[PDB]
Amino acid sequence: SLEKQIESYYQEIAQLIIDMIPEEWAEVRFYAQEDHDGWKIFFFHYLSASSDEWTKDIDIRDVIKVPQDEFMEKYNELSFCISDFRKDYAEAFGEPWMSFQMTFYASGKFNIDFYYDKNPFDTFLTRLAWQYEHFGTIPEDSFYKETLNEYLEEKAQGKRYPFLEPLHHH
Amino acid sequence: SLEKQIESYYQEIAQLIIDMIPEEWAEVRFYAQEDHDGWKIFFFHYLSASSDEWTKDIDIRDVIKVPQDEFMEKYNELSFCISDFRKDYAEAFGEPWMSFQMTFYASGKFNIDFYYDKNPFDTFLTRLAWQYEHFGTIPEDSFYKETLNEYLEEKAQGKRYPFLEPLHHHH
């Protein structure tokens, strides 16, 4: 079925991410983006089981035990998998996704949503805005805070970027 | 012309590498490989203008002052450029290259060669073997050393891997 084939892409992507995570995790959220011209942004965050804090993929290198090339190899395979998935999806569906979001849990639950919007933001600002939407994080550094304001002023005008957003007292 | 179009890829690849380099540099050596199923290895080293020591691409991230995502962005663009190049080259000439090496200098001078062999080694060992062939490096760490032995054992049998060797009767 088409559903099972989508599950296989999920499993293959999740496994590559799991291969890069150096410790026990409770939850992972992954963002992947590619346009018609091959411009790409992708990253994941994961909830550490032992500290209960979210950790960025890019921070793994600080604590990594295996050689860097081993990590970069999985990174490459993940970047390939994203592009290969996009082509096949476009051949089947008739058009490509522009981005997707995937969350998965220790329990084996997952969900994946596809989006067809252009992202006007660069990699650095895409991650901060993604963080902001997913976890309410304002960053500590002042330059990072200023950069996040770029996104926040866009939202203040009534613009929305559902591609980087998660899914009555007073 | 075909010559101009292909030189335009070389320049675009060099510029992406230069964007990642955080200091003055005298020389860069680049290796790139992709097969038919999209399996990829690529990396560069550059020669510092002062030190003057060779530095690995992967070690740049210890010293950068920009956010990591800015470097990862340039990394992604370089990676795409490689695959985009390969695919256009295959369309034009009928068969893709399997790997290539490029050296370029501060002056804008460069040398390049294309290969059509399959590399049986993985990313980690490929760099070790590439470093062994370009700079004669033998790793201090004993795990790194015994990994390189896998490659040296092949060489003891007369096997050669020109896709990772640098681009006479004196003693």
Short mmCIF file of C-alpha atoms in Angstrom, two decimals:
data_model
loop_
_atom_site.label_atom_id
_atom_site.label_comp_id
_atom_site.label_asym_id
_atom_site.label_seq_id
_atom_site.Cartn_x
_atom_site.Cartn_y
_atom_site.Cartn_z
CA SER A 1 0.00 0.00 0.00
CA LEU A 2 0.96 3.70 -0.31
CA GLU A 3 0.62 4.02 3.45
CA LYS A 4 3.19 1.23 4.06
CA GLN A 5 5.63 2.82 1.60
CA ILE A 6 5.33 6.08 3.51
CA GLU A 7 5.96 4.08 6.72
CA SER A 8 9.16 2.66 5.18
CA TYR A 9 10.48 6.17 4.44
CA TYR A 10 9.69 7.10 8.04
CA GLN A 11 11.47 4.02 9.40
CA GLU A 12 14.53 4.57 7.24
CA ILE A 13 14.74 8.29 8.18
CA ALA A 14 14.11 7.58 11.90
CA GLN A 15 16.80 4.88 11.92
CA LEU A 16 19.46 7.23 10.47
CA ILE A 17 18.56 9.86 13.10
CA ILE A 18 18.61 7.19 15.86
CA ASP A 19 22.07 6.09 14.56
CA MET A 20 23.32 9.71 15.11
CA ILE A 21 21.81 10.11 18.61
CA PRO A 22 24.53 9.14 21.14
CA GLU A 23 22.28 8.37 24.11
CA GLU A 24 18.84 7.21 25.14
CA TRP A 25 16.04 9.43 23.78
CA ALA A 26 12.29 9.79 24.59
CA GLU A 27 11.11 11.76 21.55
CA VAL A 28 12.51 13.14 18.30
CA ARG A 29 11.26 15.96 16.04
CA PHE A 30 12.64 16.31 12.57
CA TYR A 31 12.20 19.07 9.99
CA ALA A 32 13.17 18.64 6.33
CA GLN A 33 12.83 21.11 3.50
CA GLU A 34 13.77 21.01 -0.18
CA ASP A 35 12.63 23.19 -3.09
CA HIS A 36 12.57 22.74 -6.87
CA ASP A 37 16.11 24.10 -7.21
CA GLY A 38 17.58 21.77 -4.53
CA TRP A 39 17.97 24.34 -1.77
CA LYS A 40 17.74 22.29 1.43
CA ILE A 41 17.30 22.72 5.20
CA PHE A 42 16.92 19.76 7.60
CA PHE A 43 17.59 19.21 11.30
CA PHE A 44 16.30 17.30 14.26
CA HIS A 45 16.00 17.81 17.98
CA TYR A 46 15.66 14.98 20.50
CA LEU A 47 14.45 14.69 24.07
CA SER A 48 17.19 13.07 26.16
CA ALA A 49 15.70 10.33 28.47
CA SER A 50 18.23 10.91 31.26
CA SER A 51 18.28 14.76 31.44
CA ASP A 52 14.70 15.42 30.15
CA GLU A 53 16.08 18.31 28.03
CA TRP A 54 15.83 18.85 24.31
CA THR A 55 19.15 18.58 22.45
CA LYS A 56 20.01 19.82 18.96
CA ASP A 57 21.56 17.55 16.31
CA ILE A 58 24.41 20.07 15.90
CA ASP A 59 25.33 19.72 19.62
CA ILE A 60 25.93 15.97 19.32
CA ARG A 61 29.43 16.66 17.96
CA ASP A 62 30.44 18.14 21.36
CA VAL A 63 29.87 14.79 23.14
CA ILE A 64 30.36 12.35 20.26
CA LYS A 65 32.35 9.18 20.96
CA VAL A 66 32.73 7.74 17.41
CA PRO A 67 34.85 9.57 14.77
CA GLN A 68 33.26 12.62 13.13
CA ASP A 69 33.34 10.95 9.71
CA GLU A 70 31.04 8.23 11.04
CA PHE A 71 28.51 10.85 12.08
CA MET A 72 28.93 12.77 8.78
CA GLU A 73 28.34 9.56 6.85
CA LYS A 74 24.89 9.14 8.48
CA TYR A 75 24.22 12.85 7.92
CA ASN A 76 24.94 12.34 4.18
CA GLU A 77 22.75 9.26 3.99
CA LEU A 78 19.93 11.20 5.70
CA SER A 79 20.30 14.12 3.28
CA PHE A 80 20.22 11.65 0.39
CA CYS A 81 17.16 9.83 1.79
CA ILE A 82 15.23 13.18 2.00
CA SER A 83 15.90 14.02 -1.65
CA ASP A 84 15.22 10.49 -2.89
CA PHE A 85 11.92 10.43 -0.95
CA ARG A 86 10.93 13.78 -2.50
CA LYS A 87 11.39 12.51 -6.09
CA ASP A 88 9.40 9.35 -5.57
CA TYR A 89 6.66 11.26 -3.74
CA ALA A 90 6.44 13.69 -6.66
CA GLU A 91 6.31 10.87 -9.24
CA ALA A 92 3.45 9.22 -7.30
CA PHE A 93 1.51 12.28 -5.99
CA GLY A 94 2.13 14.51 -9.08
CA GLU A 95 3.84 17.27 -7.08
CA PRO A 96 6.63 17.30 -4.43
CA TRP A 97 6.26 18.31 -0.84
CA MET A 98 8.21 21.49 -0.12
CA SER A 99 8.88 20.51 3.45
CA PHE A 100 7.82 18.00 6.05
CA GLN A 101 7.73 17.60 9.83
CA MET A 102 8.07 14.24 11.58
CA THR A 103 7.80 13.47 15.28
CA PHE A 104 8.44 10.02 16.79
CA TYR A 105 8.38 8.55 20.29
CA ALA A 106 10.11 5.81 22.33
CA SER A 107 6.75 4.00 22.11
CA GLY A 108 7.05 3.70 18.28
CA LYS A 109 4.26 6.22 17.61
CA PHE A 110 4.98 8.67 14.81
CA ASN A 111 3.34 11.30 12.61
CA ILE A 112 4.44 12.99 9.39
CA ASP A 113 2.85 16.07 7.74
CA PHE A 114 3.66 17.52 4.34
CA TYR A 115 3.63 21.19 3.36
CA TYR A 116 3.74 23.10 0.09
CA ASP A 117 4.83 26.56 1.20
CA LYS A 118 8.01 28.45 0.40
CA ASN A 119 10.14 29.23 3.42
CA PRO A 120 11.66 32.77 3.17
CA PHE A 121 14.05 32.12 6.08
CA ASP A 122 17.61 30.85 6.11
CA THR A 123 18.86 27.82 8.03
CA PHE A 124 19.86 29.62 11.19
CA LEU A 125 16.63 31.59 11.45
CA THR A 126 14.53 28.58 10.37
CA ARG A 127 15.85 26.65 13.38
CA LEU A 128 15.23 29.49 15.92
CA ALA A 129 11.67 29.99 14.66
CA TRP A 130 11.12 26.24 14.64
CA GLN A 131 12.38 26.10 18.26
CA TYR A 132 10.20 29.05 19.20
CA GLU A 133 7.07 27.45 17.75
CA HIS A 134 7.77 23.97 19.16
CA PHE A 135 9.06 24.76 22.67
CA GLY A 136 8.49 28.46 23.37
CA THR A 137 12.28 29.06 23.49
CA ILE A 138 13.60 32.61 23.27
CA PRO A 139 17.40 32.35 22.91
CA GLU A 140 19.93 33.59 25.53
CA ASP A 141 22.51 35.40 23.31
CA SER A 142 21.43 38.89 22.18
CA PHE A 143 22.32 38.47 18.46
CA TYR A 144 20.26 35.29 18.36
CA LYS A 145 17.37 37.15 20.05
CA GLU A 146 17.61 39.93 17.44
CA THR A 147 17.56 37.34 14.65
CA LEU A 148 14.49 35.66 16.15
CA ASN A 149 12.76 39.11 16.12
CA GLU A 150 12.90 39.01 12.31
CA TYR A 151 10.53 36.02 12.43
CA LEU A 152 8.48 37.50 15.28
CA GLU A 153 7.81 40.73 13.39
CA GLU A 154 6.58 38.63 10.45
CA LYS A 155 4.13 36.84 12.78
CA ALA A 156 3.02 40.20 14.31
CA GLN A 157 1.88 41.28 10.78
CA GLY A 158 -0.43 38.27 10.65
CA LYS A 159 1.87 36.00 8.61
CA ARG A 160 1.86 32.28 9.41
CA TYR A 161 4.33 29.49 8.72
CA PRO A 162 2.46 26.26 9.52
CA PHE A 163 5.43 24.22 8.14
CA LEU A 164 7.40 24.90 11.32
CA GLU A 165 4.60 24.80 13.90
CA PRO A 166 3.73 21.71 16.02
CA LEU A 167 0.27 20.04 15.70
CA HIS A 168 -9.79 27.47 28.48
CA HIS A 169 -8.74 28.49 32.00
CA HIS A 170 -7.65 32.03 32.99
CA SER B 1 31.24 26.23 -24.51
CA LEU B 2 31.42 22.90 -22.61
CA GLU B 3 34.79 24.02 -21.27
CA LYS B 4 33.33 27.23 -19.79
CA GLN B 5 30.31 25.46 -18.31
CA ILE B 6 32.45 22.85 -16.59
CA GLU B 7 34.91 25.48 -15.29
CA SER B 8 31.93 27.28 -13.86
CA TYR B 9 31.18 24.20 -11.67
CA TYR B 10 34.82 24.10 -10.49
CA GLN B 11 34.63 27.77 -9.49
CA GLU B 12 31.27 27.35 -7.77
CA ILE B 13 32.64 24.37 -5.76
CA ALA B 14 35.83 26.29 -4.83
CA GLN B 15 33.76 29.31 -3.72
CA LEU B 16 31.52 27.14 -1.50
CA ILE B 17 34.66 25.68 0.10
CA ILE B 18 36.23 29.13 0.55
CA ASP B 19 32.98 30.27 2.30
CA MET B 20 33.54 27.53 4.91
CA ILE B 21 37.24 28.30 5.51
CA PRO B 22 37.53 30.62 8.57
CA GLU B 23 41.03 32.09 7.93
CA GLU B 24 43.64 32.91 5.28
CA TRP B 25 44.54 29.84 3.26
CA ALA B 26 47.25 29.00 0.74
CA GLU B 27 45.94 25.76 -0.72
CA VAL B 28 42.86 23.54 -0.64
CA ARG B 29 42.57 19.85 -1.52
CA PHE B 30 39.11 18.50 -2.21
CA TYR B 31 37.75 14.96 -2.67
CA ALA B 32 34.23 14.09 -3.85
CA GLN B 33 32.59 10.78 -4.67
CA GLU B 34 29.06 9.69 -5.53
CA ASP B 35 27.86 6.43 -7.00
CA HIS B 36 24.80 5.41 -9.00
CA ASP B 37 22.64 4.84 -5.91
CA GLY B 38 23.52 8.26 -4.43
CA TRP B 39 26.01 6.98 -1.84
CA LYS B 40 28.33 9.92 -1.19
CA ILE B 41 31.69 10.83 0.40
CA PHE B 42 33.20 14.33 0.12
CA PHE B 43 35.68 16.38 2.13
CA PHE B 44 38.44 18.94 1.90
CA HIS B 45 41.57 19.96 3.74
CA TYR B 46 43.16 23.36 3.48
CA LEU B 47 46.69 24.65 4.14
CA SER B 48 46.75 27.57 6.58
CA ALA B 49 48.61 30.71 5.35
CA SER B 50 50.41 31.29 8.67
CA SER B 51 50.95 27.99 10.63
CA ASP B 52 51.40 26.60 8.02
CA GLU B 53 49.55 23.42 8.89
CA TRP B 54 46.86 21.45 7.05
CA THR B 55 43.38 21.59 8.59
CA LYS B 56 40.43 19.20 8.06
CA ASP B 57 37.04 20.56 7.02
CA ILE B 58 35.45 18.82 10.09
CA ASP B 59 37.82 20.67 12.48
CA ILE B 60 36.69 24.10 11.24
CA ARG B 61 33.66 23.83 13.56
CA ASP B 62 35.88 23.99 16.67
CA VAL B 63 37.03 27.47 15.76
CA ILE B 64 34.19 29.14 13.83
CA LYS B 65 32.55 32.18 15.35
CA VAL B 66 29.43 32.07 13.14
CA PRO B 67 26.46 29.88 14.20
CA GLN B 68 26.92 26.18 13.27
CA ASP B 69 23.83 26.36 11.04
CA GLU B 70 25.61 28.84 8.81
CA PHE B 71 28.40 26.35 8.22
CA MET B 72 25.88 23.47 7.83
CA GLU B 73 24.11 25.59 5.25
CA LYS B 74 27.29 25.93 3.16
CA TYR B 75 27.96 22.22 3.70
CA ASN B 76 24.49 21.39 2.29
CA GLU B 77 25.02 23.69 -0.70
CA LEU B 78 28.37 22.05 -1.48
CA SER B 79 26.80 18.63 -1.16
CA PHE B 80 23.96 19.57 -3.55
CA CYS B 81 26.42 21.17 -6.00
CA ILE B 82 28.31 17.83 -6.19
CA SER B 83 25.20 15.80 -7.06
CA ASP B 84 23.80 18.45 -9.43
CA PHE B 85 27.15 18.55 -11.25
CA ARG B 86 27.27 14.74 -11.53
CA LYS B 87 23.80 14.54 -12.95
CA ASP B 88 24.35 17.30 -15.55
CA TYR B 89 27.72 15.78 -16.48
CA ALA B 90 26.01 12.38 -17.00
CA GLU B 91 23.28 13.91 -19.16
CA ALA B 92 25.82 15.74 -21.32
CA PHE B 93 28.51 13.11 -21.70
CA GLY B 94 26.44 9.97 -21.24
CA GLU B 95 28.24 8.51 -18.21
CA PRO B 96 28.79 10.08 -14.76
CA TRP B 97 32.14 10.37 -13.03
CA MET B 98 32.45 8.21 -9.88
CA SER B 99 34.72 10.57 -7.97
CA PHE B 100 37.03 13.52 -8.48
CA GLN B 101 39.84 15.37 -6.80
CA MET B 102 40.58 19.10 -7.00
CA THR B 103 43.49 21.17 -5.77
CA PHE B 104 43.32 24.96 -5.88
CA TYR B 105 45.55 27.76 -4.66
CA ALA B 106 45.26 31.35 -3.31
CA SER B 107 46.19 32.54 -6.85
CA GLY B 108 43.09 30.93 -8.38
CA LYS B 109 45.22 28.24 -10.05
CA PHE B 110 43.76 24.73 -9.91
CA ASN B 111 44.12 21.13 -11.09
CA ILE B 112 41.40 18.52 -11.35
CA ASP B 113 41.00 14.84 -12.27
CA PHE B 114 38.00 12.54 -12.72
CA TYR B 115 37.86 8.81 -11.92
CA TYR B 116 35.49 5.97 -12.75
CA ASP B 117 36.53 3.35 -10.13
CA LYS B 118 34.38 2.11 -7.23
CA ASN B 119 35.71 2.87 -3.78
CA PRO B 120 35.24 -0.14 -1.47
CA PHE B 121 36.11 1.89 1.65
CA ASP B 122 33.81 3.80 3.98
CA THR B 123 33.96 7.53 4.89
CA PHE B 124 36.22 7.19 7.90
CA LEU B 125 38.73 4.89 6.20
CA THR B 126 38.57 6.82 2.91
CA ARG B 127 39.82 10.01 4.64
CA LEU B 128 42.52 8.09 6.57
CA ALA B 129 43.78 6.54 3.34
CA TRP B 130 43.46 9.82 1.47
CA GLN B 131 45.48 11.55 4.25
CA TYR B 132 48.05 8.72 4.13
CA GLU B 133 48.49 9.20 0.37
CA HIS B 134 48.64 13.03 0.32
CA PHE B 135 50.63 13.79 3.49
CA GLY B 136 51.96 10.34 4.51
CA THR B 137 50.05 10.65 7.80
CA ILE B 138 49.95 7.56 10.02
CA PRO B 139 47.51 8.04 12.94
CA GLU B 140 48.75 8.09 16.54
CA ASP B 141 45.57 6.54 18.05
CA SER B 142 45.73 2.71 17.88
CA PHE B 143 42.11 2.23 16.65
CA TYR B 144 42.69 4.76 13.80
CA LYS B 145 45.98 2.92 13.03
CA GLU B 146 44.39 -0.52 12.77
CA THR B 147 41.62 0.89 10.55
CA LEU B 148 44.25 2.29 8.17
CA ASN B 149 45.88 -1.20 8.15
CA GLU B 150 42.86 -2.49 6.25
CA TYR B 151 43.90 -0.11 3.44
CA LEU B 152 47.68 -0.73 3.82
CA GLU B 153 47.06 -4.50 3.58
CA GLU B 154 45.56 -3.95 0.10
CA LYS B 155 48.51 -1.82 -0.92
CA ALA B 156 50.89 -4.62 0.22
CA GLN B 157 49.19 -6.73 -2.46
CA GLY B 158 49.97 -4.16 -5.16
CA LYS B 159 46.44 -2.69 -5.25
CA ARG B 160 46.34 1.06 -6.06
CA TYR B 161 43.57 3.63 -5.57
CA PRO B 162 44.48 6.55 -7.80
CA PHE B 163 41.13 8.31 -6.95
CA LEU B 164 42.76 9.15 -3.61
CA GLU B 165 46.40 9.70 -4.55
CA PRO B 166 47.94 13.21 -5.12
CA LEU B 167 47.39 14.61 -8.62
CA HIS B 168 61.03 10.42 -11.66
CA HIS B 169 64.45 8.98 -10.71
CA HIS B 170 66.00 11.23 -8.05
CA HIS B 171 66.85 9.98 -4.52
#
